[PDB]
Scaffold this active site. Structure first.
Site, PDB file in Angstrom:
ATOM      1  N   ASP A   9       0.828  -1.200   0.000  1.00 26.99           N
ATOM      2  CA  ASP A   9       0.000   0.000   0.000  1.00 26.99           C
ATOM      3  C   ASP A   9       0.869   1.260   0.000  1.00 26.99           C
ATOM      4  OD1 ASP A   9      -2.229   1.652  -0.209  1.00 26.99           O
ATOM      5  OD2 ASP A   9      -2.991   1.233   1.833  1.00 26.99           O
ATOM      6  N   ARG A  35      -0.443   8.982   0.923  1.00 28.27           N
ATOM      7  CA  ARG A  35      -1.225   9.008   2.173  1.00 28.27           C
ATOM      8  C   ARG A  35      -0.598   8.118   3.272  1.00 28.27           C
ATOM      9  NH1 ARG A  35      -3.916   6.180  -1.760  1.00 28.27           N
ATOM     10  NH2 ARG A  35      -3.689   3.930  -1.421  1.00 28.27           N
ATOM     11  N   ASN A  36       0.363   7.222   2.919  1.00 31.61           N
ATOM     12  CA  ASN A  36       1.064   6.361   3.885  1.00 31.61           C
ATOM     13  C   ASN A  36       2.529   6.757   4.063  1.00 31.61           C
ATOM     14  OD1 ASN A  36      -1.044   4.614   4.734  1.00 31.61           O
ATOM     15  ND2 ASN A  36      -0.832   3.485   2.829  1.00 31.61           N
ATOM     16  N   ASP A  92       2.025   2.912   7.383  1.00 27.12           N
ATOM     17  CA  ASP A  92       0.817   2.280   6.898  1.00 27.12           C
ATOM     18  C   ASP A  92      -0.199   2.520   7.980  1.00 27.12           C
ATOM     19  OD1 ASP A  92      -1.201   0.869   5.601  1.00 27.12           O
ATOM     20  OD2 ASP A  92      -0.116  -1.062   5.547  1.00 27.12           O
TER      21      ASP A  92
HETATM   22  C1  LIG Z   1       5.790  -2.211   5.907  1.00 24.53           C
HETATM   23  N1  LIG Z   1       5.825  -1.036   6.770  1.00 24.53           N
HETATM   24  C2  LIG Z   1       4.961  -0.779   7.781  1.00 24.53           C
HETATM   25  C3  LIG Z   1       5.305   0.403   8.386  1.00 24.53           C
HETATM   26  C4  LIG Z   1       4.637   0.997   9.596  1.00 24.53           C
HETATM   27  C5  LIG Z   1       3.316   0.645   9.906  1.00 24.53           C
HETATM   28  C6  LIG Z   1       2.708   1.173  11.028  1.00 24.53           C
HETATM   29  C7  LIG Z   1       3.396   2.059  11.856  1.00 24.53           C
HETATM   30  C8  LIG Z   1       2.700   2.550  13.112  1.00 24.53           C
HETATM   31  N2  LIG Z   1       3.017   3.944  13.485  1.00 24.53           N
HETATM   32  C9  LIG Z   1       2.298   5.034  12.977  1.00 24.53           C
HETATM   33  C10 LIG Z   1       2.694   6.337  13.289  1.00 24.53           C
HETATM   34  C11 LIG Z   1       1.959   7.400  12.711  1.00 24.53           C
HETATM   35  C12 LIG Z   1       2.318   8.801  13.001  1.00 24.53           C
HETATM   36  C13 LIG Z   1       3.452   9.209  13.683  1.00 24.53           C
HETATM   37  N3  LIG Z   1       3.398  10.532  13.817  1.00 24.53           N
HETATM   38  C14 LIG Z   1       2.279  10.992  13.252  1.00 24.53           C
HETATM   39  C15 LIG Z   1       1.777  12.291  13.117  1.00 24.53           C
HETATM   40  C16 LIG Z   1       0.569  12.521  12.466  1.00 24.53           C
HETATM   41  O1  LIG Z   1       0.042  13.783  12.354  1.00 24.53           O
HETATM   42  C17 LIG Z   1       0.693  14.928  12.928  1.00 24.53           C
HETATM   43  C18 LIG Z   1       0.355  16.196  12.147  1.00 24.53           C
HETATM   44  C19 LIG Z   1      -1.119  16.577  12.257  1.00 24.53           C
HETATM   45  N4  LIG Z   1      -1.361  17.707  11.327  1.00 24.53           N
HETATM   46  C20 LIG Z   1      -0.812  18.999  11.825  1.00 24.53           C
HETATM   47  C21 LIG Z   1      -1.762  20.085  11.243  1.00 24.53           C
HETATM   48  C22 LIG Z   1      -3.147  19.374  11.313  1.00 24.53           C
HETATM   49  C23 LIG Z   1      -2.804  17.886  11.045  1.00 24.53           C
HETATM   50  C24 LIG Z   1      -0.134  11.418  11.932  1.00 24.53           C
HETATM   51  C25 LIG Z   1       0.372  10.165  12.074  1.00 24.53           C
HETATM   52  N5  LIG Z   1       1.562   9.942  12.727  1.00 24.53           N
HETATM   53  N6  LIG Z   1       0.892   7.129  11.922  1.00 24.53           N
HETATM   54  C26 LIG Z   1       0.578   5.874  11.635  1.00 24.53           C
HETATM   55  N7  LIG Z   1       1.255   4.844  12.154  1.00 24.53           N
HETATM   56  C27 LIG Z   1       4.713   2.425  11.565  1.00 24.53           C
HETATM   57  C28 LIG Z   1       5.346   1.876  10.449  1.00 24.53           C
HETATM   58  C29 LIG Z   1       6.432   0.886   7.673  1.00 24.53           C
HETATM   59  N8  LIG Z   1       6.737   0.028   6.709  1.00 24.53           N
END
Ligand SMILES: Cn1cc(-c2ccc(CNc3cc(-c4cnc5cc(OCCCN6CCCC6)ccn45)ncn3)cc2)cn1
Length: 301
Positions: free
Chosen positions: A161, A165-166, A179
C-alpha cells in the site's frame, strides 16, 4: 489479515516471527494526547512517553492501538504487525518502532512521531509550514521514499500500500514510510474501491495484482511510480476524472498510462514510465531507482 508480506530469501507467517522483550515498555509511563488518525477499529494517538530512549527524558511518540470495538482476530493481527516492525529493524526513511506494551492490557505499538503528518495532506496544503516548497524538496522526497522502499525490499518485505497518504514527513523534511491500516476510515476514502470482497487502492495497484492478486517486489515498484505522479502533481489523485470501472481496467490492460505532471523533470517521468512497464521484469528495482535519483541530485548540485 496482516497486509505486509515477508518472503523467504514462500511467505513467512508473521505469528512465527519473534517478539524481542527488549521493546517492552510500561504503559503507566505513557500520557495520551490527541488522535492523529482513526478508522473503525484502530487509531494512532499522539503521546508523551517517559524514559523511553533516554533513561529519564520525556519524548513525543505516536501510539498504534485498537478501539474497544476490535475483535480477537484484529488484536492478533496487531501483535503480528509489531513482530514485522521489530523484524524490519531501523531505517531513517521508515516510521520506526520505539517500544511496545504487550503486558497488563491491550497491545500498544509505540513508534516515532512525525510532526508534519502525512505527505499527501502536506503536498495539498502547499497548493495555491510557513516555508514554500520547491523542486529540491520534491526530488529529496522521491529519493528518501526510494531509499526506504529499497530498505524494505532488502528485508524481503512487500509493503502492498505504497502511496503518499502512507508516507509521513517530520523535522528536517525527512519522509518516513508508514501504513495507517485500521487507523484510517477506508469506508469513507474513495481511493479504496470495493472489489465485492474488500476495499483496494486500485489506482496504485500493478496490473498483475488487480487481475491475479499477485503482490511482488515489482508490484510495489509500480505503486512507487504512481506515488511519483502524486508527488510531482502536488497531491493530485491518480487518473483524474477516470472512475475505477470496466473502462479503467481495459485501458490499464491495454497499456494506457498517465501523462507527465507539470512539475516533473523529464528524467523523473522516465522513472515513472519504467515503474509502469506491463512486464514486471523490465521495471527498475528500488536499488536501481536510488542510484538514478542520486545522479539527478548531483546533476542539480
Ligand atoms: C511495511 N511497513 C509498515 C510500516 C509501519 C506501519 C505502522 C506504523 C505505526 N506507526 C504510525 C505512526 C503514525 C504517526 C506518527 N506521527 C504521526 C503524526 C501525524 O500527524 C501529525 C500532524 C497533524 N497535522 C498537523 C496540522 C493538522 C494535522 C499522523 C500520524 N503519525 N501514523 C501511523 N502509524 C509504523 C510503520 C512501515 N513500513
Amino acid at each position: 489479515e496482516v497486509q505486509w508480506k515477508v518472503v523467504e530469501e514462500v511467505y513467512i507467517d508473521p505469528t512465527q516471527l519473534p517478539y524481542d522483550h527488549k521493546w517492552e515498555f510500561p504503559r503507566n509511563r505513557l500520557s495520551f494526547g490527541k488522535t492523529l488518525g482513526a478508522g473503525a477499529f484502530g487509531k494512532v494517538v499522539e503521546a508523551t512517553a517517559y524514559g523511553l530512549i533516554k533513561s529519564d527524558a520525556a519524548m513525543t511518540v505516536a501510539v498504534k492501538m485498537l478501539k474497544p470495538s476490535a475483535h480477537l482476530t484484529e488484536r492478533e493481527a496487531l501483535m503480528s504487525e509489531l513482530k514485522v516492525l521489530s523484524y524490519l529493524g531501523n531505517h531513517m526513511n521508515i516510521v520506526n518502532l520505539l517500544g511496545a506494551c504487550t503486558i497488563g492490557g491491550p497491545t500498544l505499538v509505540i513508534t516515532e512521531y512525525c510532526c508534519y503528518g502525512d505527505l499527501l495532506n502536506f503536498l495539498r496544503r502547499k497548493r495555491d509550514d510557513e516555508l514554500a516548497l520547491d523542486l529540491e524538496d520534491l526530488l529529496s522526497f522521491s529519493y528518501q521514499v526510494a531509499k526506504g522502499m529499497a530498505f524494505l525490499a532488502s528485508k524481503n518485505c512487500i509493503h502492498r500500500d505504497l502511496a503518499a497518504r502512507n508516507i509521513l514527513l517530520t523535522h528536517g523534511r525527512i519522509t518516513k514510510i508508514c501504513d495507517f491500516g485500521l487507523a484510517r476510515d477506508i469506508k469513507n476514502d474513495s481511493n479504496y474501491v470495493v472489489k465485492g470482497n474488500a476495499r483496494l487502492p486500485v489506482k496504485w495497484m500493478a496490473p498483475e495484482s488487480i487481475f491475479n492478486c499477485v503482490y511482488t517486489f515489482e508490484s510495489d515498484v509500480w505503486s512507487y511510480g504512481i506515488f511519483l505522479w502524486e508527488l510531482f502533481s502536488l497531491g493530485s489523485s491518480p487518473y483524474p476524472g477516470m472512475p475505477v470501472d470496466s473502462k479503467f481496467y481495459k485501458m490499464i490492460k491495454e497499456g494506457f498510462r498517465m501523462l507527465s505532471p507539470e512539475h516533473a523533470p523529464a528524467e523523473m517521468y522516465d522513472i515513472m514510465k519504467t515503474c509502469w512497464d506491463a512486464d514486471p521484469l523490465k521495471r527498475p528495482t528500488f536499488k536501481q531507482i536510488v542510484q538514478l535519483i542520486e545522479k539527478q541530485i548531483s546533476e542539480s548540485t
